[PDB]
Design a protein around this nucleic acid. Structure first.
Ligand SMILES: Nc1ncnc2c1ncn2[C@@H]1O[C@H](COP(=O)(O)OP(=O)(O)NP(=O)(O)O)[C@@H](O)[C@H]1O
Ligand SMILES: [Mg+2]
Length: 509
RNA sequence: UUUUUUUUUU
């Protein structure tokens, strides 16, 4: 299908809620809702996408816009307008399906729909239900039946689950599907699910298999997502609306980026602790920060250290996929409202989540994928605000920083070295209550995570894996101690004959 | 000795 490029341009007439109202694109009721939010104007992506999304042209839409620049309302505004345009047709049926890669992001998008409802009670007739995992299935279906929503927001697993059982009842009249964080939903492990969802929706559609229009949004995407999305895009024309220059870096330019390079992976923990201690002092505890880590087990470990160091100064919140869904939701609600605190998380919180007035994004080690560097740091500097980010890595992770320059055109000007004092090491290690078996589990989780991104980040396997493994000895304060394991385990790892495996493990079987 | 998410509360 034909991809039509509409690139970023300089002096082009500003689009406003009024001008869209005056020109007949937006109805009074949706103009009213958004006006009462009292935004200075419409963001660039909103100005660019609202009219094309609503145009009677038979096209799909792809939109690129930097983190924190209002992509959510860029799709919700025209979705509401479509619901108004067709209000007497199939009024009890789902007309728009929005899919997100995480439950908390799905729930956030729903909360934003509810804000529109709150600014104009006349829009409540266009009801919304979220379909996400870790929530009661029956309670959610009771809500579908009671409210007969025109808008569904969902994560892929639970959406497929509902569709296999109830696609005929609610989903035969869908006109739009939206992939938020589209590039993420089209990677391995979501792409097949999105193809399944798209196939069901197209097959059940009462008008035709090509009826549904598809909208893709992300801060990180290009021409190549069209290829990846080929089986889910129905229309013969695809509009690519871009608010970023072709060669311009995708990272938000307002973020003051830096990297702190240690000799050892474990030293990044000490660097981060000292950085946080200094920020708490200098800002008189007026400090709101998010710190990312590579694995669930390590995030949990890092939370223990940060609580021991900083619980007296700031709240420390632990956010990952093994936290119960009730707690994930309640902690997201709190950190959205709070003026200060530290959110410690995995890449579950890398994309989409909008926590106002975060001062800094910190990262210990590398993201779960290259693009997530851009999304991670984009948790700060949202809707016009300032922000900073610090990447704490060790020397053997430097090829990641080179790949950021090579692949994404991101050059971090501020780079410095770090070496921990014996004082900080003692302070951090002595409060660690984890048993050796727990430290082993934690470091093994890191070995696995790093092993999986060696090719993508161009690491040297023979250097990076031993360095990650050596964290075990560092944390037990004995640097020639290796991780005790079984031969059966080493065989499973595929390192039984490797000198790399010999440098990491001791067969204490 | 589940590497990040993502139905199984249908
Ligand atoms: N026109 C506007 N003017 C000012 N703020 C806005 C506007 N539209 C939305 N916002 C706010 O901007 C913040 C970020 O919007 P959001 O839609 O989450 O960004 P996004 O582009 O999806 N970011 P990401 O998902 O991180 O790539 C939210 O707090 C919105 O309320
Ligand atoms: Mg978003």
């Amino acid at each position: 299908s034909k991809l039509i490029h509409v690139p970023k341009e300089d002096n082009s007439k500003e689009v406003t809620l009024d001008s869209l109202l005056e020109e007949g694109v937006l109805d009074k009721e949706i103009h009213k809702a958004i006006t009462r939010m009292e935004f200075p104007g419409l963001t660039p992506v909103q100005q660019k996408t609202i009219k094309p999304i609503l145009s009677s042209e038979d096209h799909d839409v792809i939109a690129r816009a930097k983190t924190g620049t209002g992509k959510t309302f860029a799709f919700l505004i025209p979705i509401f307008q479509h619901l108004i345009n067709t209000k007497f047709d199939s009024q009890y049926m789902v007309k728009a399906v929005i899919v997100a890669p995480t439950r908390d992001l799905a729930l956030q998008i729903e909360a934003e729909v509810k804000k529109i409802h709150d600014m104009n009670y006349g829009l409540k007739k266009y009801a919304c239900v979220s379909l996400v995992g870790g929530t009661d299935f029956r309670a959610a279906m009771n809500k579908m039946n009671k409210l007969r929503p025109n808008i569904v927001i969902a994560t892929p697993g639970r959406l497929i689950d509902v569709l296999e059982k109830y696609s005929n009842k609610f989903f035969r009249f869908v006109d739009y599907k939206v992939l938020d964080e589209a590039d993420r939903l089209l990677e391995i492990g979501f792409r097949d699910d999105l193809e399944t969802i798209s196939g069901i929706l197209n097959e059940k559609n009462s008008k035709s298999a090509d009826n549904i229009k598809t909208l893709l949004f992300s801060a990180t995407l290009d021409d190549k997502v069209q290829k990846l999305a080929n089986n889910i895009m129905n229309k013969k024309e695809c509009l690519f609306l871009d608010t970023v220059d072709k060669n311009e870096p995708e990272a938000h330019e307002r973020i003051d980026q830096s990297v702190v390079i240690s000799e050892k992976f474990a030293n990044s923990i000490f660097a981060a602790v000292e950085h946080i201690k200094k920020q708490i002092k200098e800002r008189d505890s007026n400090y709101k920060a998010i710190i990312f880590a590579p694995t669930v087990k390590f995030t949990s470990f890092l939370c223990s250290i940060l609580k021991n160091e900083f619980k007296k100064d700031l709240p420390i919140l632990e956010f990952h996929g093994k936290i119960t869904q009730n707690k994930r939701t309640s902690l997201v609600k709190r950190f959205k409202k709070d003026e200060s605190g530290i959110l410690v998380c995995t890449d579950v919180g890398a994309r989409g989540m909008d926590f106002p007035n975060v001062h800094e994004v910190l990262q210990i080690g590398v993201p779960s994928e290259l693009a997530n560097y851009i999304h991670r740091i984009g948790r700060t500097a949202r809707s016009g605000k300032e922000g900073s980010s610090v990447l704490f890595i060790c020397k053997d992770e430097l090829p990641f920083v080179r790949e950021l320059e090579d692949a994404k055109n991101i050059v971090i000007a501020k780079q410095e070295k770090y070496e921990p004092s014996e004082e900080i090491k003692s302070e951090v290690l002595e409060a660690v209550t984890e048993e050796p078996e727990d430290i082993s589990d934690i470091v093994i989780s890191l070995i696995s995570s790093y092993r999986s991104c060696i090719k993508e980040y161009r690491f040297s396997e023979r250097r990076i894996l031993p360095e990650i493994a050596s964290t075990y000895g560092v944390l037990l304060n004995d640097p020639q101690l290796k991780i005790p394991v079984s031969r059966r385990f080493l065989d499973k790892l595929g390192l039984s004959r490797s000198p790399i495996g010999k440098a990491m493990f001791e067969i204490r079987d």
